[PDB]
Protein backbone atom coordinates (compact mmCIF):
# COMPACT_ATOMS: atom_id res chain seq x y z
CA UNK A 1 0.00 0.00 0.00
CA UNK A 2 1.25 3.44 -1.06
CA UNK A 3 0.53 6.75 0.68
CA UNK A 4 -0.79 5.17 3.85
CA UNK A 5 0.21 4.69 7.47
CA UNK A 6 0.58 1.63 9.67
CA UNK A 7 -2.87 0.15 10.29
CA UNK A 8 -4.24 0.10 13.81
CA UNK A 9 -3.46 -3.08 15.76
CA UNK A 10 -7.19 -3.84 16.18
CA UNK A 11 -8.76 -2.77 12.86
CA UNK A 12 -7.89 -5.82 10.71
CA UNK A 13 -8.94 -8.92 12.67
CA UNK A 14 -10.30 -10.42 9.41
CA UNK A 15 -7.12 -9.88 7.32
CA UNK A 16 -5.34 -13.10 6.33
CA UNK A 17 -1.75 -13.42 5.10
CA UNK A 18 -0.92 -16.01 2.42
CA UNK A 19 2.63 -17.34 2.40
CA UNK A 20 4.94 -20.13 1.32
CA UNK A 21 8.65 -20.85 1.75
CA UNK A 22 9.42 -17.50 0.08
CA UNK A 23 7.28 -15.44 2.45
CA UNK A 24 4.09 -13.37 2.19
CA UNK A 25 2.68 -13.05 -1.33
CA UNK A 26 -1.03 -12.24 -0.91
CA UNK A 27 -3.69 -11.20 1.54
CA UNK A 28 -7.15 -12.64 2.15
CA UNK A 29 -10.38 -12.10 4.08
CA UNK A 30 -11.88 -14.39 6.73
CA UNK A 31 -15.67 -14.34 6.11
CA UNK A 32 -16.66 -16.97 8.68
CA UNK A 33 -15.00 -19.58 10.97
CA UNK A 34 -14.00 -21.91 8.10
CA UNK A 35 -13.87 -19.81 4.93
CA UNK A 36 -11.45 -17.35 3.40
CA UNK A 37 -11.86 -15.28 0.24
CA UNK A 38 -8.92 -14.08 -1.89
CA UNK A 39 -7.96 -13.49 -5.53
CA UNK A 40 -7.76 -16.44 -7.93
CA UNK A 41 -4.34 -15.35 -9.18
CA UNK A 42 -2.97 -15.89 -5.67
CA UNK A 43 -3.44 -19.66 -6.00
CA UNK A 44 -0.34 -21.82 -5.64
CA UNK A 45 0.44 -25.52 -5.22
CA UNK A 46 1.87 -25.13 -1.70
CA UNK A 47 0.96 -22.30 0.65
CA UNK A 48 -0.35 -21.69 4.15
CA UNK A 49 -2.41 -18.97 5.79
CA UNK A 50 -1.58 -16.95 8.89
CA UNK A 51 -4.41 -15.31 10.84
CA UNK A 52 -4.18 -12.76 13.66
CA UNK A 53 -0.97 -11.23 12.30
CA UNK A 54 0.11 -7.60 12.66
CA UNK A 55 3.89 -7.40 12.96
CA UNK A 56 5.97 -10.06 11.20
CA UNK A 57 8.78 -9.61 13.76
CA UNK A 58 6.94 -9.14 17.08
CA UNK A 59 4.31 -11.86 17.09
CA UNK A 60 0.84 -11.52 18.54
CA UNK A 61 0.36 -14.35 21.01
CA UNK A 62 -2.93 -15.44 19.42
CA UNK A 63 -1.62 -15.96 15.87
CA UNK A 64 -2.98 -19.05 14.06
CA UNK A 65 -1.75 -21.08 11.08
CA UNK A 66 -4.14 -22.90 8.71
CA UNK A 67 -3.84 -25.00 5.56
CA UNK A 68 -6.13 -25.00 2.50
CA UNK A 69 -8.47 -28.00 2.73
CA UNK A 70 -10.48 -27.18 -0.40
CA UNK A 71 -10.12 -24.53 -3.13
CA UNK A 72 -12.97 -23.18 -5.26
CA UNK A 73 -12.46 -21.33 -8.53
CA UNK A 74 -15.21 -20.30 -10.97
CA UNK A 75 -15.94 -23.30 -13.19
CA UNK A 76 -16.50 -20.96 -16.12
CA UNK A 77 -13.16 -19.15 -15.86
CA UNK A 78 -10.54 -18.61 -18.55
CA UNK A 79 -7.36 -19.57 -16.69
CA UNK A 80 -5.34 -17.40 -19.07
CA UNK A 81 -7.07 -14.07 -18.40
CA UNK A 82 -6.14 -12.79 -14.94
CA UNK A 83 -8.93 -10.22 -15.00
CA UNK A 84 -11.52 -12.91 -15.68
CA UNK A 85 -13.39 -13.83 -12.49
CA UNK A 86 -10.39 -13.16 -10.23
CA UNK A 87 -11.83 -14.72 -7.08
CA UNK A 88 -11.06 -17.88 -5.09
CA UNK A 89 -12.79 -19.45 -2.08
CA UNK A 90 -10.78 -21.47 0.46
CA UNK A 91 -12.12 -23.85 3.10
CA UNK A 92 -9.75 -24.05 6.09
CA UNK A 93 -8.44 -27.40 7.33
CA UNK A 94 -9.71 -26.48 10.81
CA UNK A 95 -12.17 -23.84 12.11
CA UNK A 96 -11.03 -20.60 13.72
CA UNK A 97 -12.27 -19.19 17.05
CA UNK A 98 -12.63 -15.48 17.79
CA UNK A 99 -9.72 -13.94 19.69
CA UNK A 100 -8.18 -10.52 20.32
CA UNK A 101 -6.80 -10.25 16.79
CA UNK A 102 -9.03 -12.71 14.94
CA UNK A 103 -12.63 -12.31 13.76
CA UNK A 104 -14.48 -12.77 10.45
CA UNK A 105 -16.00 -10.04 8.27
CA UNK A 106 -19.35 -10.88 6.67
CA UNK A 107 -20.13 -10.75 2.95
CA UNK A 108 -21.61 -7.47 1.64
CA UNK A 109 -25.36 -7.01 2.02
CA UNK A 110 -25.63 -4.17 -0.49
CA UNK A 111 -23.86 -3.08 -3.71
CA UNK A 112 -21.10 -0.44 -3.56
CA UNK A 113 -21.86 3.22 -4.25
CA UNK A 114 -19.60 5.40 -6.41
CA UNK A 115 -18.02 8.22 -4.44
CA UNK A 116 -18.02 6.11 -1.30
CA UNK A 117 -14.91 6.21 0.90
CA UNK A 118 -13.06 2.87 1.02
CA UNK A 119 -10.08 1.56 2.96
CA UNK A 120 -7.25 -0.62 1.66
CA UNK A 121 -4.73 -2.67 3.65
CA UNK A 122 -1.89 -5.13 3.20
CA UNK A 123 1.75 -6.06 3.63
CA UNK A 124 2.45 -5.04 0.03
CA UNK A 125 5.16 -2.62 -1.10
CA UNK A 126 5.04 0.84 0.46
CA UNK A 127 7.12 2.38 -2.37
CA UNK A 128 5.68 2.99 -5.91
CA UNK A 129 8.63 1.95 -8.10
CA UNK A 130 11.18 0.04 -6.04
CA UNK A 131 9.72 -2.70 -3.84
CA UNK A 132 9.77 -2.08 -0.10
CA UNK A 133 7.85 -4.58 2.03
CA UNK A 134 6.87 -3.55 5.59
CA UNK A 135 6.88 -5.66 8.74
CA UNK A 136 3.45 -4.27 9.60
CA UNK A 137 0.40 -3.86 7.36
CA UNK A 138 -0.25 -0.38 5.97
CA UNK A 139 -3.68 1.24 5.54
CA UNK A 140 -5.03 4.05 3.36
CA UNK A 141 -8.39 5.65 2.52
CA UNK A 142 -9.44 6.05 -1.12
CA UNK A 143 -12.66 6.55 -3.10
CA UNK A 144 -14.84 4.30 -5.22
CA UNK A 145 -14.57 5.77 -8.72
CA UNK A 146 -16.79 5.65 -11.79
CA UNK A 147 -16.04 2.46 -13.75
CA UNK A 148 -15.43 4.57 -16.87
CA UNK A 149 -12.24 5.85 -15.25
CA UNK A 150 -10.59 2.43 -15.10
CA UNK A 151 -11.98 1.55 -18.53
CA UNK A 152 -10.22 4.56 -20.05
CA UNK A 153 -7.01 3.70 -18.23
CA UNK A 154 -6.77 -0.01 -19.08
CA UNK A 155 -7.27 -1.30 -22.65
CA UNK A 156 -7.22 -4.86 -21.31
CA UNK A 157 -10.18 -4.16 -19.04
CA UNK A 158 -13.20 -5.74 -20.72
CA UNK A 159 -16.64 -4.49 -19.72
CA UNK A 160 -17.71 -8.08 -19.01
CA UNK A 161 -15.34 -8.46 -16.07
CA UNK A 162 -17.22 -7.75 -12.85
CA UNK A 163 -14.87 -5.25 -11.27
CA UNK A 164 -14.72 -2.06 -9.20
CA UNK A 165 -12.55 1.01 -9.77
CA UNK A 166 -10.94 2.64 -6.72
CA UNK A 167 -8.33 5.31 -6.02
CA UNK A 168 -8.04 9.12 -5.89
CA UNK A 169 -7.92 11.50 -8.88
CA UNK A 170 -4.78 13.34 -7.77
CA UNK A 171 -3.03 10.01 -7.21
CA UNK A 172 -0.67 9.09 -4.38
CA UNK A 173 -2.64 6.34 -2.59
CA UNK A 174 -3.03 2.87 -4.09
CA UNK A 175 -2.40 -0.83 -3.52
CA UNK A 176 0.90 -2.17 -4.82
CA UNK A 177 2.92 -5.35 -5.27
CA UNK A 178 1.93 -7.88 -2.64
CA UNK A 179 -1.49 -6.50 -1.67
CA UNK A 180 -3.36 -8.79 -4.08
CA UNK A 181 -6.15 -10.84 -2.55
CA UNK A 182 -6.74 -8.35 0.25
CA UNK A 183 -10.06 -6.61 1.02
CA UNK A 184 -11.50 -3.33 -0.17
CA UNK A 185 -13.76 -2.03 2.60
CA UNK A 186 -16.33 0.63 1.70
CA UNK A 187 -18.95 1.95 4.11
CA UNK A 188 -17.64 -0.67 6.53
CA UNK A 189 -18.45 -3.50 4.12
CA UNK A 190 -16.28 -6.08 2.35
CA UNK A 191 -16.92 -4.82 -1.20
CA UNK A 192 -13.84 -5.87 -3.18
CA UNK A 193 -10.74 -8.00 -3.66
CA UNK A 194 -7.38 -6.48 -4.66
CA UNK A 195 -6.97 -7.77 -8.18
CA UNK A 196 -5.12 -5.57 -10.64
CA UNK A 197 -3.24 -2.30 -11.01
CA UNK A 198 -0.31 -0.67 -12.81
CA UNK A 199 3.37 0.06 -12.14
CA UNK A 200 4.57 2.33 -10.85
CA UNK A 201 1.78 2.33 -8.27
CA UNK A 202 -0.33 5.39 -7.45
CA UNK A 203 -0.81 6.99 -10.87
CA UNK A 204 -3.90 9.18 -11.00
CA UNK A 205 -5.07 7.93 -14.44
CA UNK A 206 -4.60 4.26 -13.51
CA UNK A 207 -6.57 3.51 -10.34
CA UNK A 208 -6.80 0.07 -8.78
CA UNK A 209 -9.09 -2.65 -10.12
CA UNK A 210 -10.93 -4.80 -7.60
CA UNK A 211 -13.15 -7.86 -7.99
CA UNK A 212 -16.80 -6.99 -7.33
CA UNK A 213 -17.55 -9.25 -4.36
CA UNK A 214 -21.30 -8.51 -4.21
CA UNK A 215 -21.85 -10.09 -7.63
CA UNK A 216 -20.45 -13.41 -6.38
CA UNK A 217 -22.20 -13.69 -3.01
CA UNK A 218 -24.70 -16.17 -4.44
CA UNK A 219 -22.00 -18.46 -5.85
CA UNK A 220 -20.08 -18.24 -2.56
CA UNK A 221 -23.07 -19.07 -0.36
CA UNK A 222 -23.97 -22.00 -2.64
CA UNK A 223 -20.45 -23.43 -2.35
CA UNK A 224 -20.53 -23.00 1.42
CA UNK A 225 -23.95 -24.66 1.54
CA UNK A 226 -22.53 -27.71 -0.22
CA UNK A 227 -23.37 -27.36 -3.92
CA UNK A 228 -19.75 -26.92 -5.00
CA UNK A 229 -21.26 -27.30 -8.48
CA UNK A 230 -22.83 -23.86 -8.93
CA UNK A 231 -21.48 -21.58 -11.64
CA UNK A 232 -20.36 -17.98 -11.35
CA UNK A 233 -22.20 -15.06 -12.94
CA UNK A 234 -21.06 -14.81 -16.59
C1 LIG B 1 4.95 -18.69 -3.38
O2 LIG B 1 3.62 -18.45 -3.87
C3 LIG B 1 3.54 -17.33 -4.79
C4 LIG B 1 2.09 -17.23 -5.25
O5 LIG B 1 1.90 -17.82 -6.52
C6 LIG B 1 4.50 -17.51 -5.97
O7 LIG B 1 4.51 -16.34 -6.77
C8 LIG B 1 5.92 -17.82 -5.48
O9 LIG B 1 6.78 -18.08 -6.58
C10 LIG B 1 5.85 -19.04 -4.55
N11 LIG B 1 7.17 -19.44 -4.10
C12 LIG B 1 7.48 -20.74 -4.06
C13 LIG B 1 8.74 -21.14 -3.31
O14 LIG B 1 6.79 -21.61 -4.61
Which long-range contacts link 20-26 to residues 24+ away (Cβ below 8 Å)? 20/44, 20/46, 20/47, 20/48, 21/46, 24/56, 24/123, 24/133, 24/178, 25/178, 25/180, 26/178, 26/180, 26/181, 26/182
Measured in angstroms, the resolution is 2.1
Q: Based on the domain organization, do 28 and 42 belong to the same domain? A: yes
Does residue 170 have its Cβ closer than 6 Å to ligand 1?
A: no
Q: Based on the domain organization, do 2 and 114 belong to the same domain? A: yes
For the CA of 41, the closest atom of ligand 1 is 5
Q: Based on the domain organization, do 172 and 153 belong to the same domain? A: yes
How many CB atoms sit inside 10 A of residue 149's CB?
A: 18
What's 7's DSSP letter? P
Pocket test for ligand 1, best of 18, 19, 22, 40 (most atoms within 8 A of CB): 22
Q: Based on the domain organization, do 117 and 2 belong to the same domain? A: yes
Ligand 1: residue whose CA is nearest its atom 5: 44
Does residue 45 have its Cβ closer than 6 Å to ligand 1?
A: no
Contact 212, 170 (CB under 8 A): no
Domain contains 232: no
Q: Based on the domain organization, do 112 and 94 belong to the same domain? A: no
Q: How far apart are CA 91 and CA 101, in angstroms?
A: 20
Q: Is 98 exposed, middle or buried (0-12, 13-18, 19+ CB in 10 A)?
A: exposed
Q: How far apart are CA 137 and CA 148, in angstroms?
A: 30
Dihedral angle computed from the Cα positions of residues 118, 218, 95 and 18, in that order, rounded to the nearest 10 degrees? -50
Nearest one of 93, 91, 89 to 218, comparing CA atoms: 89
Q: Based on the domain organization, do 116 and 209 belong to the same domain? A: yes
- Count how many Cα atoms sit within 13 Å of the Cα of residue 173 in the half-sphere of its side chain: 19
Q: How far apart are CA 184 and CA 211, in angstroms?
A: 9
Domain contains 208: yes
Nearest one of 200, 212, 220 to 144, comparing CA atoms: 212
Domain that holds residue 195: 1-12+105-214
Ligand 1: residue whose CA is nearest its atom 7: 25
Residue 34: give its domain's CATH number: 2.40.10.10
Domain contains 234: no
Does residue 22 have its Cβ closer than 6 Å to ligand 1?
A: yes
Q: Based on the domain organization, do 210 and 166 belong to the same domain? A: yes
Residues forming the active site: 41, 86, 180
Q: Is 198 exposed, middle or buried (0-12, 13-18, 19+ CB in 10 A)?
A: middle
Count structural domains, the chain: 2
Strand 138-145 relative to strand 208-212, pairing: unpaired
Amino acid sequence: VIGGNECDINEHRFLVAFFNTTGFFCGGTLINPEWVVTAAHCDSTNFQMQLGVHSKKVLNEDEQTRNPKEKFICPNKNNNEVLDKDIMLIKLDKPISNSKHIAPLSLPSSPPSVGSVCRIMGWGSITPVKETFPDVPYCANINLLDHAVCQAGYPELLAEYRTLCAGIVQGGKDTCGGDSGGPLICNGQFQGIVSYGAHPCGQGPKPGIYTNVFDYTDWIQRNIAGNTDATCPP
